[PDB]
Amino acid sequence: EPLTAFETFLPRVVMAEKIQDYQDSDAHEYMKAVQGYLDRFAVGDRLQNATRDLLVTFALAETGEKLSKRLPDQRVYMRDTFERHKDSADDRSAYLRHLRDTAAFIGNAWEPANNSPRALPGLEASAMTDTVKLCLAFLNSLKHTIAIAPLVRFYSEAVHADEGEAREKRVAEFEKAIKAITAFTVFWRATRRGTGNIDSQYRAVMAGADSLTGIGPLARQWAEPDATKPDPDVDAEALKKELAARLSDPKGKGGVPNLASFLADASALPLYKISPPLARFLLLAAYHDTIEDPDNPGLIVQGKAGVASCFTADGWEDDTHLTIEHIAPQSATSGWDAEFYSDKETVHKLGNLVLAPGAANASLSSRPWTEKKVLYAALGASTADDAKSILNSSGFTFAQTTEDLAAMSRYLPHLRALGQREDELDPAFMDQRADVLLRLAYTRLKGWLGLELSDSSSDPVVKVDD
Amino acid sequence: GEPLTAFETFLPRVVMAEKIQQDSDAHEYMKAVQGYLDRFAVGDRLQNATRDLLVTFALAETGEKLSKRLPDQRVYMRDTFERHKDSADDRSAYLRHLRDTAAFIGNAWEPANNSPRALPGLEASAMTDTVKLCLAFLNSLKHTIAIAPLVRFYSEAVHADEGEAREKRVAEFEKAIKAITAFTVFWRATRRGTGNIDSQYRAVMAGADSLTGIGPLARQWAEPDATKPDPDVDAEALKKELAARLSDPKGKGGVPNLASFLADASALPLYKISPPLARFLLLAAYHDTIEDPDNPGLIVQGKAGVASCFTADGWEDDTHLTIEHIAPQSATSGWDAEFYSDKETVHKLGNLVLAPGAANASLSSRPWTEKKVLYAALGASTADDAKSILNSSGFTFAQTTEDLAAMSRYLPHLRALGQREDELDPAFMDQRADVLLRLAYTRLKGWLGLELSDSSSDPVVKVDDVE
Amino acid sequence: TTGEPLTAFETFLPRVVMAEKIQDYQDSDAHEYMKAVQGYLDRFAVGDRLQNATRDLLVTFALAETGEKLSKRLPDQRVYMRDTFERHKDSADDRSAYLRHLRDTAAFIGNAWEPANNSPRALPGLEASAMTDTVKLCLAFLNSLKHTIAIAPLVRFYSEAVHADEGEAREKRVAEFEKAIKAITAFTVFWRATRRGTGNIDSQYRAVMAGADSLTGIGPLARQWAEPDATKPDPDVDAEALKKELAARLSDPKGKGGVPNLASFLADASALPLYKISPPLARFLLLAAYHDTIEDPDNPGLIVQGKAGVASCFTADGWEDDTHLTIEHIAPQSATSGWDAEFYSDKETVHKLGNLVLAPGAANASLSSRPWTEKKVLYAALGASTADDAKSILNSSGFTFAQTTEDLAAMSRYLPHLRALGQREDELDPAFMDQRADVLLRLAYTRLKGWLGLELSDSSSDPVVKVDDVE
Amino acid sequence: GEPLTAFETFLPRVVMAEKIQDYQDSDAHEYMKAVQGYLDRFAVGDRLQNATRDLLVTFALAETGEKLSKRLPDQRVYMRDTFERHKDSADDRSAYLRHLRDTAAFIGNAWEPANNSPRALPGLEASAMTDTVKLCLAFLNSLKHTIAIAPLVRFYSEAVHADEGEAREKRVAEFEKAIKAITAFTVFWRATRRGTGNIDSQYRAVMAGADSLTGIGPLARQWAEPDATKPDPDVDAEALKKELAARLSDPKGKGGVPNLASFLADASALPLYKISPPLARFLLLAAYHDTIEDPDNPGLIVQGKAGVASCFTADGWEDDTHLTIEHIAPQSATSGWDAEFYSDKETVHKLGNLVLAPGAANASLSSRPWTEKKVLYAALGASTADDAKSILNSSGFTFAQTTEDLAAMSRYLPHLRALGQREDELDPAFMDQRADVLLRLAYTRLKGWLGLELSDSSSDPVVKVDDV
């Protein structure tokens, strides 16, 4: 098997310490850690793939990167940018520290080992807050590896920082950073058909350039080797405002200038087919602390804080109680308005999606709305007794026992709401539903990015396309 | 048809004062409480739930310690309702308080069948990891007495103005929950029975015999009438008061220094007394540990975040972290008979590990010689090393190599035991218990403001709790 | 893994690293302090020099942390080192101050005691002001005497001066360091001047570090207690405590220093061949004695205190000045003509303080083995105020010396003890040198006395037990 | 046969006071014998003449601040003039003579000690002879700054006359404060000006002063206008310090140096080594003291740990062999070197081009290409002689001296280590940056001696002014 660009770099990291002779040299503790992470992968492709992917994100993190997957190209760069630190002792030290930090992060925070939780090595478990846990989980699910580079940067700084006040400040900044990255990615991705090359945006941020804000590079060092000015990993506005603008500024390639355009873009796409993880993240954002709408029978509205909370790491992980389920079946089925199957994409838009217990699926699948209405009313009941009363009160006999479905019952307003809807369901209604949902989601993620799009609404609004 | 609860008897009474005036919003607080009770089936469940709601209510409004009997419950409600016959806003905040205790018991303490835990009116942020872990633990322990003080801090967090005020009171709620939990853990770990902890909490609520300058924790005074406001504080008041109740010679907590805590806890069959308590202690102990390079089979604190388990997740993780006995619970071969001199030996902290529950089929009643390989394997960094270890050994276990390797996880305390070359005796488990109880103490210490002297015997009475 | 033994320090390094599971290590405090110690050892070549340097660093370390005389043997050092690090397993800050202490002793040995090849002496972390004239003179002398035992107590005061807050705190501890250095030095000089061999001074210092038979109320001087565990604090204090403890050890009937009054000091010192025992000690005594002296108007061969600053030699400069102030014997070391045979009855006579002068070293070629009659002119000349009078004196004499008149005049300098001897008309005998020694030892005592807080009885005769160090 | 010095002419004039009868006078005799003592040191002829007239000159500055000429008849007078001022009082013609004793004492022991003796302050303990005092005396003497004698005698005289214990010590510490202030003032004035710029004139004013910028009056013992209504004394701690501080640094003053920018600009520009090698040396020692090689600007230095590399000391001053002033760009046009350096004949002599290096090595450094000088500095500045060997051998070069030999002269010297690390070629621009760094560090070190605090405001308020 071919030697990875990593093992080719170790001799180079040994000719470069004179002689500790190492190990006792520092590199050999940072470098041992990285080895620790790679040892996790079996010789052959897994070891190859893991190493080249570690190096790729490394390049983005030390300089805006875009280092290719090909091996000879990686053997360089490692060479290139170590020679940059031939002279200084402490600077070929911080560099290697940086490589340790990216392996630390990928291995523990991004893709933890088989049974372990997620962690930020060197940072306490307090740092591993609920929001941090939910974003890591989501970004990973989306396979958004590009987000690793900016994240390592804030992690690296949190570790290196002095204990007490310094560490905490940088830890809180890490959360601010993770939120901003996530919200930006969600908004960009919800509002576009494909990936629309988000990656290209992130690299530009890392490297700097095309900076909508006054802000400079996010990588550790400058791509142009030499120094006249410092480089700062700051997120309080810097990441936030820069990303905010990249999405929402006419000068930016994010084609989303106001609320009405966001709603129009997202409403229109088959989000479930594009990215089930994204659909799920949006649904959780939307349904969190909602209550059935007293005036619009199908709909929901924001309610008491903590009354129906799902927008959490636990909620993300909870496939068992909160599975994505289609209201209008994915396929033409009787008991349903044919309008829904004009466009193959209709059934997959946010408005048609609910979160329901996964087991019930056997009873919900391909049934007329008449049947589903009872099921949602039941599955959304406050006690299993009410579910029992609802299910029996109905004439229907479902695929599962009354006793069984009642067990799966839980307080879920969006389900209760749909159960109360007396009027028939059509694509027009799902569009209204999507609007309601996308608004609530926006209201929840908005703060993460510092967004405040015009809800001038038509008046002083230009419904713009990307 | 069946006999009416002391709750329904109270609603007429809440209406003759409403008092029309569906017309009254007080109905809204009262409607909410009804919401919670409707959850219980007519008969025993409805009766039990209502009388338990009222009991904690009494402690929270007053230190009353209201009995289980029904006629005695009809009485309180009228007793302490009339107290608020005159003022409009004061029979309002009172009812608000009853709403808050039902809100709390129903959502925070014992949530509905498939829902998470919540603090109604407080955001999901308030539902922090530590808050979630303590609620989970206290519930598991069935420590219902902790509800009364907790409602009090909840109630205040709700009632507080948005923004700065709410957050301050929310942070205080966490401080409070930690202090209550640490206090309960320390008290309970260090005593044979329940040692009447309850009596301590009620005293705090009232609270009699306050070691610190601090006054009652309930909403109102048990002696009906007012000259001064009622304290409801924690940042020292609850913390220091509880700290002292455990650790002060004047207090009934018989634990004056570290050496005595270690001596008391080391000696008890904690697993038999309270498996929940054993588990909470083990999680505290093992959190961010690394195998000891000098004392084989022992552990020491390590890098922050390297092996964290002291979390809500860890508490809930029965699948990866099950309590397992090192020396089998019963006399079995491959094991020193020393362990079965005292039927309590096997159940002391030092003999307990956290391991994946599935493996149990392979660990059960096996000689140490084997358990050593199993722990070494189950605690491995990769499943490849687990394979390497299991195969390397001669043994064939109840489960396939492939299977056990799958259960591998990085767990230093297991790695540590796998490296131990010397035979295991009760002397070693006692050393183990010492190490563990110290780490636990180090972790819970901050929750209570504790700082017991460890003089390493330096000027140290090793003191027993006093009959 | 090459050749000869691995030093205790290297063995210890692995242990110092295991003790830091959580953090760093590089970030670790230890591998900053420990890098510094490495700095000092790197100075020595592989083999004996590296071995010797390391084991000696560890020895003084032991005395300084716990007043324990750690042996030279390696296995004993590997162990001594582990023992007392495990004492600080638990606390972060306490295995930190401990390592700081090891840094401080290497800092001190390397810069203050035996500086690098061309560098001055320094107290790392302390300003150059701290490097006062007296500090410089004592370090120079103690080093010359090879009094390595003094390193342990000295590190202790240094360590505290560094660790102290800037401004008032640092200065107070720096001034205490000088007080300390004086006391150590004066005590060592008095003990050693008054005894035949080393009389085991070392044993005294170790007792102080540990002490342990403390004549004063004073407790240990080491950082920590040899008996591992703590109930009470330990002080490195110098002025309230140190002078007094040392003072008593020399001068108290309960103490092993056998020197209870002035008359016994004078009797003990007068009698020993100090120059043979320790030329450095003789030199330090002579400088103390001759400092600010003037020829005695009433006794021809002798000297008395004079105006402040008139003829100062008791200084770092004076100590270093081998060129102008070399120890020279008045009666030649061997039987030579022109000299009374009395001087060679006892082989030790010629080497007692009274027979020693400080003179320019070059002149030696002209002074060597010459009759007194000549040496008299030479001293009179070499001690002259101007080189003109020196020429006046040398020419005025009939003699032709080994060096030209012009040459010797060039070395002429104002030196009363030389002027005084040149005026002595009466012949020189051992009786006269004894009187000389008395005068000298008194002046020395008067100068060093303050350093130690001493005030010995000169009452006697009226009341003088002239006591011997034995019995 | 040669003319009688104004001193011997003054003894007849002195005895009349006692006059013929007493001691006689015993006190005066003791004082005279002491001054006579000092003069006896000089050979009859020119040396005796010169020494006596110079003793009298500084005496005049110290007693009346009068700038007495070198000519003899003018000296026989003033002596006469100012003794008749004390015809009446016994104790006042006593303190006067005491003052003359003190100036001879000072010149003879503190300023120019006898052939092999150390420096001393007669009547003051050896403690008084502190390191800073020793370094300043040594420097001022080297600079030939005889004008500084007058103010210094004044503080000495007062330290002697003062009661033992508290009084003496206070006046002794004041003598150090005084010596620092005089020295710093002289260094700053002289570093910043082309010629001597008549510093002397400044000092005289202070003694008689006279044109005071501060409220302070004369520094001499007595008033030049003979008669008394008020006492004359100056504490330096405010007075000498503040007065001198202002004379250098005040728009009203003839010192044309109002801020840091102007100081740096003035000093950077002058061929200091050619103007005054002693001054260059004093500045270099100030600058290099406790420095460490700059991690960002190679070849540059920055302040470091206290006591890591101390050279600003009496020992350092005297240490010619270890710390000799050496030019980086050779004094003359040589190959291996940028011709830029020889545009202006003065360039090579500016502070930035000067290092302190062991004097013996000179045989290996002289007129060599930089490429070599770089290795040599790196080697000579090494921490151990092993590293010096490592460096010298590691280089291809063979120098005038053996590797073994040069390694021996090795000493820890950051400014040398720093230059050894410099990869970029050397030009006049670099030496200017170097001079800036050095002059700043020197300023930071001497600043406290004078109570100075010049605006480093310049980017905010640069100015900056020239002198005159």
Numbering used by the authors:
A (entry chain B): 334 to 799
B (entry chain D): 333 to 353, 356 to 801
C (entry chain A): 331 to 801
D (entry chain C): 333 to 800
Article passage:
PT recognition enlarges the GTP-binding pocket, thereby increasing GTP hydrolysis activity, which subsequently triggers a conformational switch of SspE from a closed to an open state.
However, the side chains of the C-terminal half, including residues 327-771, could not be resolved due to the mediocre resolution of the X-ray diffraction. The crystal structure had four molecules in the asymmetric unit of SspECTD.
